[PDB]
Design a protein around this ligand. Structure first.
Ligand SMILES: CSC[C@H]1O[C@@H](n2cnc3c(N)ncnc32)[C@H](O)[C@@H]1O
Ligand SMILES: CSC[C@H]1O[C@@H](n2cnc3c(N)ncnc32)[C@H](O)[C@@H]1O
Ligand SMILES: NCCCN[C@H]1CC[C@H](N)CC1
Ligand SMILES: NCCCN[C@H]1CC[C@H](N)CC1
Lengths: 281, 281
């Protein structure tokens, strides 16, 4: 069997590999190279431009933490936007909240949605919910144009190389601020603390120009490089996102596999060297 | 440049690679294959039997968490044992406590010590401290023979394939229990929660046959497989190891890079699926 290897100028000198059971699908979409393969030990794997987006084995860690952190802090979230997230894992976690009335997703690449609906049925199931509305367009444009404001925006983008290159700058954060309710929250996937701390500092400084309270949390996920990934956390009130306002007790949450009330606050307890780098921003 | 790749029957289907700047030393010792190379981005790297033991870039995360968790909980630790740990990183963190009167290390492979003294001088500096006494022998035998009891034992072993195969069974845990003071603590490196949960359950069940309080904590370290590693935590009193009894304020601790008073308790907040697997042991 051959191995897939994740190599990138974004983390030089290191690489993670998974063994391939079977390649399932490859295409060059309008935006990205798309690869779906069944791995031998992590189930199916989605790859965009040679970078792992998810595997069936660990995706719940990332989709649960990114969704339930801001959604247990928002008191009565009615309108949620997902930026990127074509695979549908965030939407899947959002549909669990009976209270939500509308879930918009702006995903630039409809191939990713259609690929997820075919090959990742337990991730893309949320697309069946009549509350979900899909916009195929660059979130950088959508956020300039949208009329509605949201209670929560979840930026589930791929990396800065490729069509996500527009989601990693000061302008983008102003657009997010303006599209949120006066008490609304944004979480965004953010750089592994083991890799470019300079990037984390840059993003934090972007968010801090607008938001009252900017926190960084860390998630353990093994198929992202360095085995972890950050959440950049943006709040308009001084109270921030470290402390949930509700517990997930109803039947729709029974099945959760990573996220719980205590993990929520714990994700925000960072390594000493990280606190020192981001103390004077 | 060539790449070093970490492949193992202990985590099939996956592999982590580092690019090689220069190989520095290789030998077949009495026990293991030993490889020291300077990587392009993680500094020098120590490899035993094809498995990464440390790199200069991230070793502090593991050596700080394994040492300072039990050493901030022990009230006045006077005698500490390190099992394995030939590289000296634990001893380096131990020497920081002025109070400690004696530090014994039982390392089966003296080549690892001598290699660390030559090629890893900022890790092996602790060997110069007149409080440190080295025993070259299998810890499985040493723990049967030692007369002293310790306030803290830190099991810093390599993996179950190779000479560490004796440190992963019920007998080993009884030896640890007997070598500890009535209020003494043991921490042991323990399986990544992303890989063999069955192993974690087995080890927990071993420790629980003897110890009042058996906790599992997780450390983020990118050059261990799946980017994290557990600490099996064994206490003879019901109070356990999640809560430090002291803060590290004196000048010897100024330089700490991962471990702080809040990270300590946070390491013990685990993923939902892990708590569910280890609730009925
Ligand atoms: C797989 S989840 C990440 C998704 O982010 C999507 N994405 C990347 N860049 C953008 C963008 N500028 N706007 C909307 N979605 C994006 C990618 O096409 C991918 O499907
Ligand atoms: C590099 S730190 C881990 C150390 O554990 C040491 N080690 C492995 N098995 C044993 C054992 N049975 N007793 C003492 N040390 C051990 C290895 O030789 C290695 O240097
Ligand atoms: N919805 C899963 C996609 C997650 N987005 C990113 C994939 C690329 C990774 N290096 C970081 C997160
Ligand atoms: N003192 C550093 C050695 C750490 N012991 C182990 C090395 C092998 C890893 N897979 C797990 C920890």
């Amino acid at each position: 069997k051959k191995w897939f290897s994740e190599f990138s100028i974004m983390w030089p000198g290191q690489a993670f590999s998974l063994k391939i059971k079977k390649i399932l699908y490859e295409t060059k979409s309008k935006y990205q190279n798309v690869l779906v393969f069944e791995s031998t030990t992590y189930g199916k794997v989605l790859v965009l431009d040679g970078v792992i987006q998810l595997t069936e084995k660990d995706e719940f860690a990332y989709h649960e933490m990114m969704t339930h952190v801001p959604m247990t802090v928002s008191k009565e979230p009615k309108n949620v936007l997902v930026v990127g997230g074509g695979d549908g894992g965030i939407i899947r976690e959002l549909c669990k909240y009976k209270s939500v009335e509308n879930i918009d997703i702006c995903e630039i690449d409809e191939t990713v949605i259609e690929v997820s609906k075919i090959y990742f049925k337990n991730i893309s199931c949320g697309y069946e919910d009549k509350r979900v509305n899909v916009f195929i367009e660059d979130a950088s444009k959508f956020l300039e144009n949208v009329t509605n404001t949201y209670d929560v925006i979840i930026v589930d983008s791929s990396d800065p190389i490729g069509p996500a290159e527009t989601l990693f700058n000061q302008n983008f954060y102003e657009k997010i601020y303006n599209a949120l309710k006066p008490n609304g929250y944004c979480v965004a996937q953010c750089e592994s603390l083991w890799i470019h701390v300079g990037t984390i500092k840059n993003m934090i400084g972007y968010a801090k120009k607008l938001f009252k309270k900017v926190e960084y949390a860390n998630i353990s996920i093994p198929t992202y490089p360095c085995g972890c990934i950050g959440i950049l956390c943006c709040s308009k009130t001084d109270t921030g996102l470290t402390k949930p306002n509700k517990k997930l007790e109803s039947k729709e949450f029974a099945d959760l596999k990573y996220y719980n009330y205590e993990n929520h606050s714990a994700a925000f307890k960072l390594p000493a060297f990280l606190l020192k780098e981001i103390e004077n921003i």
